[PDB]
Design a protein around this motif. Structure first.
Motif, PDB file in Angstrom:
ATOM      1  N   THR A  61       6.951  -2.826  36.154  1.00 41.46           N
ATOM      2  CA  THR A  61       5.586  -3.024  35.715  1.00 41.46           C
ATOM      3  C   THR A  61       5.061  -1.769  35.063  1.00 41.46           C
ATOM      4  OG1 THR A  61       3.335  -3.584  36.344  1.00 41.46           O
ATOM      5  CG2 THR A  61       4.577  -2.236  37.839  1.00 41.46           C
ATOM      6  N   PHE A  62       5.389  -0.615  35.623  1.00 40.41           N
ATOM      7  CA  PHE A  62       4.839   0.621  35.106  1.00 40.41           C
ATOM      8  C   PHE A  62       5.271   0.827  33.687  1.00 40.41           C
ATOM      9  CE2 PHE A  62       5.081   2.799  39.496  1.00 40.41           C
ATOM     10  CZ  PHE A  62       3.984   2.072  39.894  1.00 40.41           C
ATOM     11  N   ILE A  63       6.553   0.669  33.446  1.00 38.89           N
ATOM     12  CA  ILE A  63       7.078   0.910  32.130  1.00 38.89           C
ATOM     13  C   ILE A  63       6.455  -0.038  31.125  1.00 38.89           C
ATOM     14  CG2 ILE A  63       9.135   0.839  30.714  1.00 38.89           C
ATOM     15  CD1 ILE A  63      10.630   2.247  32.698  1.00 38.89           C
ATOM     16  N   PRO A 123      10.183  -0.480  43.992  1.00 35.10           N
ATOM     17  CA  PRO A 123      11.195  -1.511  43.751  1.00 35.10           C
ATOM     18  C   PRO A 123      11.414  -1.694  42.282  1.00 35.10           C
ATOM     19  CG  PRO A 123       9.435  -2.360  45.147  1.00 35.10           C
ATOM     20  CD  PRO A 123       8.901  -1.248  44.361  1.00 35.10           C
ATOM     21  N   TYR A 124      12.522  -2.271  41.848  1.00 37.50           N
ATOM     22  CA  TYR A 124      12.824  -2.250  40.434  1.00 37.50           C
ATOM     23  C   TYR A 124      11.718  -2.908  39.691  1.00 37.50           C
ATOM     24  CZ  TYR A 124      15.047  -2.804  36.023  1.00 37.50           C
ATOM     25  OH  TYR A 124      15.362  -2.679  34.707  1.00 37.50           O
ATOM     26  N   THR A 125      11.251  -4.031  40.197  1.00 37.46           N
ATOM     27  CA  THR A 125      10.111  -4.747  39.666  1.00 37.46           C
ATOM     28  C   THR A 125       8.864  -3.881  39.735  1.00 37.46           C
ATOM     29  OG1 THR A 125       8.533  -6.492  40.315  1.00 37.46           O
ATOM     30  CG2 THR A 125      10.349  -6.038  41.811  1.00 37.46           C
ATOM     31  N   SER A 126       8.687  -3.148  40.825  1.00 41.41           N
ATOM     32  CA  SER A 126       7.505  -2.314  40.945  1.00 41.41           C
ATOM     33  C   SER A 126       7.583  -1.309  39.829  1.00 41.41           C
ATOM     34  CB  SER A 126       7.473  -1.604  42.292  1.00 41.41           C
ATOM     35  OG  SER A 126       6.457  -0.619  42.316  1.00 41.41           O
ATOM     36  N   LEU A 127       8.777  -0.777  39.615  1.00 40.56           N
ATOM     37  CA  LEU A 127       9.029   0.169  38.541  1.00 40.56           C
ATOM     38  C   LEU A 127       8.831  -0.466  37.191  1.00 40.56           C
ATOM     39  CD1 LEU A 127      10.149   2.975  37.729  1.00 40.56           C
ATOM     40  CD2 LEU A 127      12.332   1.801  37.439  1.00 40.56           C
ATOM     41  N   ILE A 145       3.810 -12.774  31.382  1.00 41.61           N
ATOM     42  CA  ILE A 145       3.308 -11.414  31.392  1.00 41.61           C
ATOM     43  C   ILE A 145       2.440 -11.123  32.605  1.00 41.61           C
ATOM     44  CG2 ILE A 145       3.355 -11.610  28.918  1.00 41.61           C
ATOM     45  CD1 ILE A 145       0.161 -10.810  29.432  1.00 41.61           C
ATOM     46  N   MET A 146       2.563  -9.936  33.185  1.00 44.56           N
ATOM     47  CA  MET A 146       1.935  -9.648  34.479  1.00 44.56           C
ATOM     48  C   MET A 146       0.451  -9.491  34.343  1.00 44.56           C
ATOM     49  SD  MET A 146       4.832  -9.751  35.382  1.00 44.56           S
ATOM     50  CE  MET A 146       4.869 -11.092  36.564  1.00 44.56           C
ATOM     51  N   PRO A 147      -0.302  -9.743  35.406  1.00 45.28           N
ATOM     52  CA  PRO A 147      -1.762  -9.733  35.257  1.00 45.28           C
ATOM     53  C   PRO A 147      -2.228  -8.379  34.787  1.00 45.28           C
ATOM     54  CG  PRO A 147      -1.226  -9.504  37.571  1.00 45.28           C
ATOM     55  CD  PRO A 147      -0.019 -10.036  36.896  1.00 45.28           C
ATOM     56  N   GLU A 148      -1.432  -7.349  35.026  1.00 43.40           N
ATOM     57  CA  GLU A 148      -1.867  -5.985  34.779  1.00 43.40           C
ATOM     58  C   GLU A 148      -2.254  -5.810  33.325  1.00 43.40           C
ATOM     59  OE1 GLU A 148       1.250  -5.297  37.140  1.00 43.40           O
ATOM     60  OE2 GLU A 148      -0.389  -5.468  38.591  1.00 43.40           O
ATOM     61  N   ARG A 205      12.009 -11.163  51.491  1.00 41.48           N
ATOM     62  CA  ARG A 205      12.084  -9.745  51.247  1.00 41.48           C
ATOM     63  C   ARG A 205      11.186  -9.542  50.051  1.00 41.48           C
ATOM     64  NH1 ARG A 205      16.777 -11.367  51.245  1.00 41.48           N
ATOM     65  NH2 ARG A 205      18.071 -12.305  49.609  1.00 41.48           N
ATOM     66  N   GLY A 206      10.240  -8.636  50.170  1.00 36.06           N
ATOM     67  CA  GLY A 206       9.144  -8.555  49.233  1.00 36.06           C
ATOM     68  C   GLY A 206       9.671  -7.980  47.958  1.00 36.06           C
ATOM     69  N   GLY A 207       8.835  -7.860  46.940  1.00 34.02           N
ATOM     70  CA  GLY A 207       9.322  -7.354  45.680  1.00 34.02           C
ATOM     71  C   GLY A 207       9.409  -8.353  44.563  1.00 34.02           C
ATOM     72  N   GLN A 208       8.753  -9.489  44.726  1.00 34.27           N
ATOM     73  CA  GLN A 208       8.656 -10.454  43.656  1.00 34.27           C
ATOM     74  C   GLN A 208       7.280 -10.328  43.063  1.00 34.27           C
ATOM     75  OE1 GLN A 208       6.660 -14.266  43.988  1.00 34.27           O
ATOM     76  NE2 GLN A 208       8.664 -14.924  44.702  1.00 34.27           N
ATOM     77  N   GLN A 209       7.208 -10.131  41.755  1.00 38.47           N
ATOM     78  CA  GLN A 209       5.945  -9.941  41.053  1.00 38.47           C
ATOM     79  C   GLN A 209       5.126 -11.207  41.014  1.00 38.47           C
ATOM     80  OE1 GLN A 209       5.838  -6.471  37.688  1.00 38.47           O
ATOM     81  NE2 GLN A 209       6.292  -8.589  37.129  1.00 38.47           N
ATOM     82  N   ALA A 210       3.808 -11.096  40.936  1.00 41.19           N
ATOM     83  CA  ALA A 210       3.097  -9.837  40.865  1.00 41.19           C
ATOM     84  C   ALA A 210       3.018  -9.381  42.283  1.00 41.19           C
ATOM     85  CB  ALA A 210       1.709 -10.057  40.329  1.00 41.19           C
ATOM     86  N   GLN A 211       2.385  -8.247  42.544  1.00 42.04           N
ATOM     87  CA  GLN A 211       2.294  -7.789  43.920  1.00 42.04           C
ATOM     88  C   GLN A 211       3.671  -7.601  44.544  1.00 42.04           C
ATOM     89  OE1 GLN A 211      -1.320  -6.554  44.824  1.00 42.04           O
ATOM     90  NE2 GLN A 211      -0.487  -7.774  43.151  1.00 42.04           N
TER      91      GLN A 211
END
Ligand SMILES: Cc1cc2nc3c(=O)[nH]c(=O)nc-3n(C[C@H](O)[C@H](O)[C@H](O)COP(=O)(O)OP(=O)(O)OC[C@H]3O[C@@H](n4cnc5c(N)ncnc54)[C@H](O)[C@@H]3O)c2cc1C
Ligand code: SF4
Ligand code: SF4
Ligand code: SF4
Ligand code: SF4
Ligand SMILES: [Fe+2]
Ligand SMILES: [Fe+2]
Ligand SMILES: [Fe+3]
Ligand SMILES: [Fe+3]
Ligand code: NI
Ligand code: NI
Lengths: 385, 280, 228, 385
Positions: free
Chosen positions: B144-146, B138-142, D229-232, C98-104
């Motif tokens: 985080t990586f960047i 997902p864009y957010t999933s993406l 900022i994300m926990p990561e 719908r999932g996809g909200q950070q974190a997780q």
């Protein structure tokens, strides 16, 4: 009794002589700190000279905290003139100031590192500061022309605005730097506690002063509150009053210590006070600066103009520019009449401090006493100018 | 294995622009653009470029210049297939060709088989192109990586590609990579059961894997796609060298495809063992 | 003495709060009326004892390894498992997610616990009114199932639109336009255009209270005993 | 060393796992707190959905601090829309928030009472909280429709306004409640000291944040200061960074603890800091809330309209609504374009805390360490949403 004079005190920019009066145990009773450096006399030299000059001459007042000085001068002058920096132009100034806080603090660590850090570590410790120091400079020089002593900042704007290619090149450098700086402070924070200077060291009742965490607000300042009085009144000794090269600037008739420690307590909320506390404050303070660095950087117009055109001939009216130098609050007041400065006054962060520093070095055995002074990380060249 | 195919080749489009901006081969953009010349397709729907940075929003481009803007790879859901009704309907298109992930691709063919309320659309697609997808995020999933992983803004990465055994971000003045095993949580729950690494349904399928960098391996599943490809190679847009000859061996690609099936199959057993409904 | 256990998988936690709402009962009740065990919120023992009934606040999530793991454990541990609050019973507002909200960003799917494991009874509501929750506990404690007949039946319920009383009842021609179901809307999404209920989806959480409170949906002649 | 994991930590809404690294004495060294609850994903689910929905879906984020959430959402949305609540409408919102603070705090006491109060007392202690709790609810539900999860508050107004008969009925209840609440806190205040948790427990150097004692001011907030900022990045461990379900919101690049303790220090003036201090702060805090309750109530228009009519289709411009939830500062930002939300972000008071909580549980023997965490009274469902 016996009074021990340390001159000049080591590891701080410029020269100040600390004079101490001690009981037999050697616990100090009166601590006097004064700056014996000869006055380069910028405040006077600027007068009757053009506005365009004032930022250039003034920043030479101090080559460590040059960016704050330049910023203050321009702000004071632009304010007297009434030029309005466009937002990109304003953002560039803030971005430079942040890079400067980060850098300046790092320079301070290099200086005080020897007392704090074991020799085995120290070559490594010093290297890191250089590493953090080196990246921060890239931003200060790149935005503001060469820095130290950046010539780029100018009345009513910035000389030019960084290209997107430059801004991008900068960002990775700042963003990547963020992990090292975070760790660097912890090591510094870790080191400072270990020293375990006696608790209750360097505690003074003097009021702190802050305008803003990074960029300073003119509005939150009182000409009414502020006053400056010559050492001749303030000092105990005719010899010492005559020797001292620095005017003492009084807030509400009270000697004032302005610092990162002060900047944090006023704005961050930093309940703890100590000399150890001032040290702790310097780390977290750069920590905060560097953030804004990257923050402002990500959202930068990059094509919006920096320069705002302005009329140099000025109304007599004086204006104050206050920005936070790495060593504490700073303000520049200027009045421009006929396009040449008529009155120029600068109060530099150290200037505020020097009166508070002597009372601070009282109580604890004097061998400690220079430790208190060195915690303030005063740069005299700033204090005296 | 691969889905039954007419032939396997690794090819690159000739044009400097396609090589310049195309992720790999530049075959999808080149193949799609050529069709426009030939006119087999009036227009195609190609993901990107979205309002967010590196976010793809599907767009149907009649213009070749437009296809070039579309060309690149964005590893996020872009629901290409939403367009198809829109593209055929308003910018009226008798025959339209689209670039579809295997996933989308599964979605179209059944629809062509079972329109069930798609009117006249079903006939209209002329060439559908399938791009191998291991997983996409997902864009957010993406995002985080960047940033947590690579410490770079979403702005800076000029191009992002998943290199074999790695994730690569290309930014001016740098290339940054993190291991895939790092990537493992993020891709959508839906893909956990996506069987087809290659696009078996798609008329022609293009993927980076099994070809040297800058070379894209295109496998022609169906005869119409094959024809369009044969025509293009005759055109000389693409330089084609038979797949088996050039390392890495397409056997490796085959192994990758197999691995995907092993992953799908158990997941389904687990979903099947559990109450929750499963297609497949 | 009877052991009640409540485990909140993924819940706004209103349901627990409603439980504390019945104040007059409440202070005594934990102490005298009921024994509460294995409640992370209300107690601190990590591994659950066998419990006479288990109350599960929130819809399970497929992705989360723990929630699923916990749910399987729960069935053995609780002699009777009851899912309460819509979020356990119907999946409630959760469904909209719908999932996809950070974190997780991955966690996108939530399902009523009921679908995963057979559940003896679920009483819905977001939260359930404190009184109903108290009435059941006394009922469960006092062991009468004529009363809980409706709930045992409700365990089946799962998906519930606002939309559904229109399909479930108004369409059937059952509806008489009494207005009871609109009153039973926590959200206030439902409202009555003449004279049938008209509801606006922007504002419906799919709690299911409206299907349950329509007199038409199921009439207990149990109550007649209660008044008189 | 040895690291002990408590999961989930007891007596707090939701689930968080605290991970501890201990020396042989068992004094902790690194304390890590993260929320392992699955994300219900409200921030995302709201997007692309109507404005009218956003308050209803959002409040379900947390059924304890539902009123603050609803208020924040409406404020954020009304602000993006630009609706102006009429003063009666505005007053009703404040009146509800106050009742909610009072109630919410009471709920917290019930939860932590077992550690604090002897069993002989406790049945009596619990009863009182229920008594204080029960009256406060009357106000929250009566003004705002059923609460918890009141459905009455709405964009640009309140759904309806209480009748004078209702307002009067309420007042006696609030005014009469005032003696019990005053006593209740003293008993709570009396109890907390007796425990005598080692002094210096739970002291952190993190900056506190407050906008307002009850109702929060949007204006006193910096988008410029704020960052998330994300926990990561933040977490030490890949396992722990991956496990944690919560983004860390950074103020000036500094982890921030926002609380009643924080709300008091910023506004009331609460020099003392401790875990015991946070507890003390929770009591006096409800004490203050309840006052405003009755204050606003006495002076209520009761016929002035609550609703202000507004245009749902919105300018792209984002707006921030910040109000003080019982557990600490809260803000909602929304941008409404085309009458459907385009970007929605919520930072809940716990979210701010979770990073500060791990450093807090360091030093004192770990058996203590959950005591520190429980003092923050975090509700995860809020932290993660
Ligand atoms: C989500 C995803 C995962 C992929 N994974 C792999 C992989 O594991 N191994 C591998 O070899 N190749 C993978 N690909 C494809 C490969 O990386 C190249 O993008 C492509 O196969 C080569 O075509 P090209 O060289 O002509 O590039 P281009 O000429 O740039 O063709 C790229 C085309 O892909 C389309 N596109 C971009 N993003 C999307 C999207 N989200 N959904 C649908 N279409 C899109 C664009 O319209 C563009 O026209 C993946 C592609 C996507 C979208
Ligand atoms: S892995 Fe499967 S489901 Fe996921 S994007 Fe690729 S084709 Fe679609
Ligand atoms: S049933 Fe309602 S109150 Fe209970 S957890 Fe679910 S949404 Fe929250
Ligand atoms: S309760 Fe049933 S019949 Fe009565 S008004 Fe509501 S929907 Fe109609
Ligand atoms: S209309 Fe009201 S009662 Fe019915 S399901 Fe929706 S929210 Fe619940
Ligand atoms: Fe001066
Ligand atoms: Fe959030
Ligand atoms: Fe200076
Ligand atoms: Fe909250
Ligand atoms: Ni200086
Ligand atoms: Ni909450």
């Amino acid at each position: 009794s016996e009074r021990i004079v340390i001159s000049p005190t080591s590891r701080q920019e410029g020269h100040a002589e600390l004079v101490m009066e001690v009981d037999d145990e050697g616990i100090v009773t009166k601590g006097r700190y004064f700056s014996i450096t000869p006055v380069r006399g910028l405040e006077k030299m600027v007068t009757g000279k053009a506005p365009e000059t004032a930022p250039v001459m003034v920043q030479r007042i101090c080559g460590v905290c040059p960016i704050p000085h330049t910023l203050a001068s321009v702000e004071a002058i632009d304010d007297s003139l009434d030029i309005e920096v466009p937002k990109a132009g304003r953002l560039l100034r803030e971005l430079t100031l942040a890079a400067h806080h980060v850098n300046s603090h790092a320079i301070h660590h290099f200086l005080i590192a020897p007392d704090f850090v074991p020799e085995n570590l120290m070559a490594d410790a010093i290297n890191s500061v250089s590493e953090i120091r080196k990246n921060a400079q890239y931003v200060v020089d790149m935005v503001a022309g060469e820095g130290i002593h950046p010539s780029d900042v100018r009345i009513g704007g910035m000389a030019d605005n960084i290209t997107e290619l430059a801004r991008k090149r900068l960002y990775a450098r700042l963003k990547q730097l963020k992990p090292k700086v975070n760790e660097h402070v912890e090591l510094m924070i870790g080191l400072i506690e270990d020293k375990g200077l006696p608790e209750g060291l360097g505690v003074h009742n003097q009021p702190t002063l802050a305008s803003h965490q990074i960029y300073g607000d003119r509005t939150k300042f009182d000409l009414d509150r502020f006053t400056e009085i010559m050492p001749e009144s303030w000092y105990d000794d005719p010899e010492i009053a005559k020797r001292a090269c620095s005017t003492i600037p009084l807030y509400d008739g009270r000697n004032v210590e302005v610092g990162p420690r002060a900047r944090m307590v006023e704005f961050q909320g930093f309940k703890e006070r100590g000399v150890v506390a001032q040290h702790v404050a310097r780390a977290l303070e750069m920590k905060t600066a560097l953030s804004r660095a990257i923050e402002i950087l990500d959202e930068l117009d990059t094509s919006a103009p920096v320069r705002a055109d302005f009329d140099e001939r000025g109304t007599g009216k004086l204006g104050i520019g206050a920005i936070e130098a790495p060593r504490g609050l700073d303000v520049h007041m200027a009045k421009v009449e006929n396009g040449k400065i008529q009155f120029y006054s600068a109060l530099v962060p150290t200037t505020w401090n020097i009166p508070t520093m002597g009372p601070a070095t009282e109580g604890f055995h004097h061998e400690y006493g220079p430790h208190v002074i060195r915690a303030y990380d005063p740069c005299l060249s700033c204090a005296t100018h | 294995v691969l889905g039954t195919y007419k032939e396997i080749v690794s090819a690159r489009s000739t044009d400097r622009e396609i090589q310049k901006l195309a992720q790999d081969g530049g075959i999808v953009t080149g193949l799609l653009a050529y069709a426009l010349d030939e006119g087999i397709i009036e227009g195609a729907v190609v993901a990107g470029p979205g309002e967010e940075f590196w976010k793809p929003q599907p767009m149907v481009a009649m213009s070749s210049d437009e296809l070039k803007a579309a060309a690149g790879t964005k590893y996020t859901f872009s629901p290409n297939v939403m367009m198809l009704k829109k593209a055929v309907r308003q910018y009226g298109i008798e025959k339209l060709g689209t670039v579809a992930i295997p996933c989308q691709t599964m979605g179209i063919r059944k629809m062509q088989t079972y329109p069930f309320g798609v009117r006249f659309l079903a006939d209209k697609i002329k060439l559908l192109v399938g791009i191998y997808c291991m997983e996409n995020f997902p864009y957010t999933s993406l995002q985080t990586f960047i940033c947590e992983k690579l410490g770079v803004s979403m702005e800076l990465v000029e191009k992002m590609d998943i290199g074999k055994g790695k994730f690569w971000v290309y930014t001016q003045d740098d290339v940054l990579t993190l291991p895939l095993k790092e990537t493992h949580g993020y891709e959508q729950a839906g893909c956990k059961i996506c069987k087809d690494y290659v696009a078996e349904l798609a008329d022609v399928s293009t993927g980076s894997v099994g070809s040297p960098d800058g070379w894209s391996t295109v496998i022609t599943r169906t005869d119409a796609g094959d024809s369009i490809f044969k025509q293009a190679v005759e055109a000389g847009l693409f330089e084609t060298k038979p797949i088996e000859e050039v390392k890495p061996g397409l056997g490796l690609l085959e192994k990758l495809a197999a691995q995907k099936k092993e992953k799908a199959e158990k997941n389904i057993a687990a979903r099947k063992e559990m109450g929750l409904p499963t297609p497949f | 003495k009877p052991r009640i256990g409540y485990i909140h998988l993924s819940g706004c936690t209103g349901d627990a709060m409603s439980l504390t709402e019945n104040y007059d009962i409440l202070a005594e009740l934990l102490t005298n009326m009921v024994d509460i065990v294995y409640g992370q919120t209300l107690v601190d023992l990590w591994e659950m004892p066998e419990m006479d009934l288990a109350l599960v606040e929130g819809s399970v999530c497929l992705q989360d390894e723990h929630s699923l793991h916990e749910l399987k454990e729960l069935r053995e541990k609780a002699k009777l498992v009851c899912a309460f609050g819509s979020c356990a019973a119907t999946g409630c507002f959760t469904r909209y997610s719908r999932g996809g909200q950070q974190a997780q960003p991955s966690h996108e799917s939530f399902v009523p616990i009921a679908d995963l494991i057979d559940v003896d009874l679920a009483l819905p509501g977001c939260p359930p009114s404190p009184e109903i929750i108290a009435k059941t506990v006394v009922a469960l404690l006092n062991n009468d199932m004529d009363y809980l007949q409706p709930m045992l039946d409700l365990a089946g319920y799962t998906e519930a639109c606002g939309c559904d009383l229109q399909t479930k009842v108004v369409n059937q021609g059952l509806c008489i336009g009494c207005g009871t179901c609109a009153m039973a809307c926590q959200t206030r999404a439902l409202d009555m255009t003449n004279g049938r209920p008209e509801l606006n989806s922007d504002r419906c959480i799919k709690c299911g209270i409206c299907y349950v409170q329509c007199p038409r949906s199921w009439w207990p002649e149990e109550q007649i005993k209660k008044e008189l």
